[PDB]
């Protein structure tokens, strides 16, 4: 009789109403639409890009809004169903912000050097009975040598869904929910952290009220 508290969000479209959390104005003033130059482009971000202004690229904020709606909906559904989300970035500028966002919510952050076999040789590295994260969110998909991330590839290896902020010089190929937007500016990164933290929290208390109602009936 618990499959109702585990199936009603799955039929209610936009169950957490996360659409009221962001607008194209909010992304525009957070400078999400800005990107790299035309020489720093990827063939697989050629679909998601509006155009080029003076050899400076601009990402389509409507596609950003739709992909962000889908990504936030997936993130909230996973936090409702009590998964584990690993927030990964290799910024060294926003490492404090990512980790403090996880600790303001209850969730986990890997902003340090990803040692080889963290997600793949996980049973030997940690212990025989460790639950790997059920969702991995990259706020910066590139490492510090501007290469796609080993944990992107390893989440694809161990069948963990991946929500990732992809910039013009990024590879959205093996990311389940790419959000084409700027991740190089403090306003954009702060807005991403704020939206994801708000989604994780609102999902968790929406869960909490649901089984509170379930136990009172």
């Amino acid at each position: 009789f618990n499959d109702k508290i585990l199936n009603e969000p799955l039929k209610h479209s936009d169950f957490f109403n996360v659409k009221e959390l962001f607008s194209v104005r909010s992304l525009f003033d957070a400078r999400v639409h800005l990107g790299h130059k035309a020489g720093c482009r990827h063939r697989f971000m050629e679909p998601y890009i509006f155009g080029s202004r003076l050899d400076h690229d601009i990402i389509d904020l409507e596609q950003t809004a739709t992909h962000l709606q889908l990504a936030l909906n997936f993130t909230a559904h996973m936090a409702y169903r009590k998964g584990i989300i690993l927030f990964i970035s290799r910024n060294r500028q926003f490492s404090y912000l990512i980790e403090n966002m996880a600790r303001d919510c209850g969730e986990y952050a890997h902003t340090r050097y990803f040692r080889g076999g963290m997600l793949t040789n996980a049973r030997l590295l940690f212990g025989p009975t460790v639950r790997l994260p059920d969702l991995i969110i990259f706020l910066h998909t590139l490492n510090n040598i501007f290469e796609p991330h080993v944990a992107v590839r390893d989440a694809a290896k161990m069948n963990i869904p991946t929500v990732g902020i992809v910039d013009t010089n990024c590879n959205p190929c093996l990311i389940t929910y790419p959000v084409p937007g700027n991740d190089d500016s403090p306003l954009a990164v702060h807005l991403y952290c704020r939206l994801f933290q708000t989604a994780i929290t609102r999902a968790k208390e929406k869960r909490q009220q649901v089984e509170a109602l379930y136990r009172l009936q």
């Binding site: 104005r25 525009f28 400078r31 790299h36 130059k37 509006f50 202004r53 409507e62 500016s185």
Partner: protein, 97 residues
């Protein structure tokens, strides 16, 4: 509602024209020794040396004027397939306010 193209044309960064020799105001947000990390808007921050004249009114949150030589600072080299990005713009600090 207004469209993303409406936001683009009625955005000042598109009203700029070319990035070169445009005076901009900006905030200091990070300081190490004498390397002042200034934002000017746009995607990245510039880093400037501390001007030795009037050298103590360059603090966290101070408004400064920049010549803004470049917006992105990338280039391609001999064997590379993409550009080598500095993740940093180029600007010349003029002073205060």
């Amino acid at each position: 509602v207004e469209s993303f193209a409406s936001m683009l044309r009625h955005s000042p960064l598109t009203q700029m024209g070319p990035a070169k020799d445009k005076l901009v105001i900006g905030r200091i947000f990070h300081i190490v020794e004498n390397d002042l990390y200034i934002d000017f808007g746009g995607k990245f921050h510039c880093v400037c040396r501390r001007p030795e004249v009037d050298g103590e009114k360059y603090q966290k949150g101070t408004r400064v004027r920049l010549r803004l030589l470049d917006l992105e600072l990338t280039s391609r080299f001999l064997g590379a397939t993409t550009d080598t990005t500095v993740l940093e713009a180029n600007a010349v600090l003029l002073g205060i306010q």
